[PDB]
Each structure stands twice: as structure tokens, then as C-alpha cells.
Amino acid sequence: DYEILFSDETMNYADAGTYCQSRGMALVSSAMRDSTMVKAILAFTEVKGHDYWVGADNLQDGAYNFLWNDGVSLPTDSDLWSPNEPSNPQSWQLCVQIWSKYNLLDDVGCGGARRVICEKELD
Amino acid sequence: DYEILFSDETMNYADAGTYCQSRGMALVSSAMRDSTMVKAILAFTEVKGHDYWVGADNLQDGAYNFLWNDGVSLPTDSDLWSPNEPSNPQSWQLCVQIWSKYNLLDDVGCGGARRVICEKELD
Ligand SMILES: [Ca+2]
Ligand SMILES: [Ca+2]
Ligand SMILES: [Ca+2]
Ligand SMILES: [Ca+2]
Ligand SMILES: [Zn+2]
Ligand SMILES: [Zn+2]
Ligand SMILES: [Zn+2]
Ligand SMILES: [Zn+2]
Ligand SMILES: [Zn+2]
Ligand SMILES: [Zn+2]
Ligand SMILES: [Zn+2]
């Protein structure tokens, strides 16, 4: 169960995190691992057909050691990934987005402007 | 362009309005009249398969004089309505929801608990 916020305003990955945080929420993460919720989230972004930041990156352990912001691993072989991703140089700082080309996850550098999705676990 | 918040938390119609307002947003209304956004919004609720409040009611003008909270009319013949709705007695105070049966609009009394959708136009 969640509160999911979608924003058409774009920002880099760091700013997306603080954007959600300032609202008492977090960049979407656990909701992406929830089979019902992730399906609803992707149904929305599918219509929008735009890139969105999600709360995962390799900043801590590097390479393809992707972590959701709540500390849970985003397996390199997850079905959430777009075909042939992740594929950027493992030595880069990598952030994860919902890539419009496939409406599935993708590794990118962290400076590009993208839309934002925030979550808040209920209760 | 907008900010759209979906919440699994249920409430009556009045409480949904206050819920959105306390967040600097409004019960979804103009976004429902936007061709891209309404489809994105409905794609999300389709997956969820649950009832959601929307920002429309007959409280100012009564009967089937439905108005979106921003004062714009919700035509009784809108393609947004579920088949054979609106159909509740015109003497009642009627509120509008996204009804899970069709994933389309429907008139109901205002006291039932339903999920909430808030919006915030972005300029
Ligand atoms: Ca794959
Ligand atoms: Ca990539
Ligand atoms: Ca009709
Ligand atoms: Ca009805
Ligand atoms: Zn769940
Ligand atoms: Zn802007
Ligand atoms: Zn892109
Ligand atoms: Zn509860
Ligand atoms: Zn629009
Ligand atoms: Zn725009
Ligand atoms: Zn119902």
C-alpha cells in the first residue's frame, strides 16, 4: 500500500531525491518491487511515454551493484530492466530511470533531467 | 502538465477534498479533462481495479448539474461517464468517482470510503 506521486517537472537524480524528501516521501523504490503497484506505476508511465527517475543507483558499491534507496538490491538480472540493460560503463556513477524507449529500467549518468515518481508506504 | 498523487487511503468525498488541500493540491479535476493525463490516470486505476474519488459533484447547482471543483461543467453526456450513468436520484447530493466496474465516472452519494487522486497544475 502506498501514496504515489508523479510529477511532470524534471530534475537530475539528486534533486529528484530531495524533491520527494521535502514532501515526506521517497523516490519510488519499494513500490517498484510490489507486483501490483509496479504494474499500476508502469501503466501510467506507459501512457506518458517519458523518462522518469526511480530510487536506485550504484553510488555506494559501484559497478552493477545497484541498490534501491531503502537498501534492497536491484538484481542485475531483474525483469524490471529494459532489454540489454544495464549496459553503461561499470566505472561510471549510475542512476536508474524508467526509460521511455521501453518503459522499463535503465542505467544512466545522474545529471540528466527526468520526471519524478515518489512513494510513501501506508499506514 | 501536472503533479498527480494517488493514495490507497480511503475516505469520504469531503475528506478527500481536505486531504488534497492539506498537501497543496486539489481533488483531480482539470487533469481529467486533459486527453493525455486522463488516459494515464485511468491506466493506473485500471490496474488497481478500485474506486477513486474525483473532483466533481452536484452540490452547487443540484440535480445533474455536475461541476468539477474548478468550476468547469462536467457535461451529463460526457464520454467520461460509465455506461448508463449518471443515474442516481436527482434530489440527492451527488459526488463523482471513478467506478471500478467500468473504470469510468459514476455518480454516488458522498459518504462512502474511496481512494483519492489529487492534482496540481504546473506552470
Ligand atoms: Ca532482461
Ligand atoms: Ca543504459
Ligand atoms: Ca455515455
Ligand atoms: Ca451512479
Ligand atoms: Zn502492495
Ligand atoms: Zn518547468
Ligand atoms: Zn531519455
Ligand atoms: Zn488503513
Ligand atoms: Zn496536458
Ligand atoms: Zn511541460
Ligand atoms: Zn464501488
A85: domain CATH number is 3.10.100.10
Q: Which three cell numbers stand for residue A26?
A: 521517497
Q: Which three cell numbers stand for residue B38?
A: 486522463
| Structural biology method used | X-ray
Cβ separation B5–A2 shorter than 8 A: no
Give the containing element (helix H, strand E) for A42. Answer: helix A35-48
Residue A57 amino acid letter: D
> Rounded distance, CA A12 to CA A108, Å?
11
CA angle A83, A85, A91 (to 5 degrees): 170
Compute the nearest-CA separation of B45 from chain A (Å).
7
- Of the candidates B2, B9, B45, the beta carbon closest to that of A8 is on B2
Distance A42 CA to ligand 7 centre (A): 16
CA distances from A56 to A35, A52, A71, A77, B64 (A): 17, 12, 9, 14, 48
Q: Which domain holds residue B109?
A: 1-123
Show residues of chain B in contact with A41, CB under 8 Å: 44
Q: Cα dihedral angle (B54, B103, A42, B31), rounded to 10 degrees?
A: -30
> Rounded distance, CA B71 to CA B60, Å?
10
> Rounded distance, CA B89 to CA B49, Å?
26
Residue A43 amino acid letter: A
Does residue A1 sit at the B interface (CB-CB below 8 Å)?
A: yes
B75 CA to centre of own chain = 13
> Rounded distance, CA A80 to CA B119, Å?
28
> Rounded distance, CA A104 to CA B2, Å?
22
Compute the nearest-CA separation of B93 from chain A (Å).
28
Q: Cα dihedral angle (A74, A77, A80, A81), rounded to 10 degrees?
A: 110
Contact B54, B13 (CB under 8 A): no
Residue count (chain B): 123
Does residue A47 sit at the B interface (CB-CB below 8 Å)?
A: yes
- Of the candidates A1, A9, A45, the beta carbon closest to that of B8 is on A1
Give chain B's domain count.
1
Q: State residue A90 phi and psi, 5-degree precision.
A: -55, -20
Q: What is the resolution of this structure in A?
A: 2.0
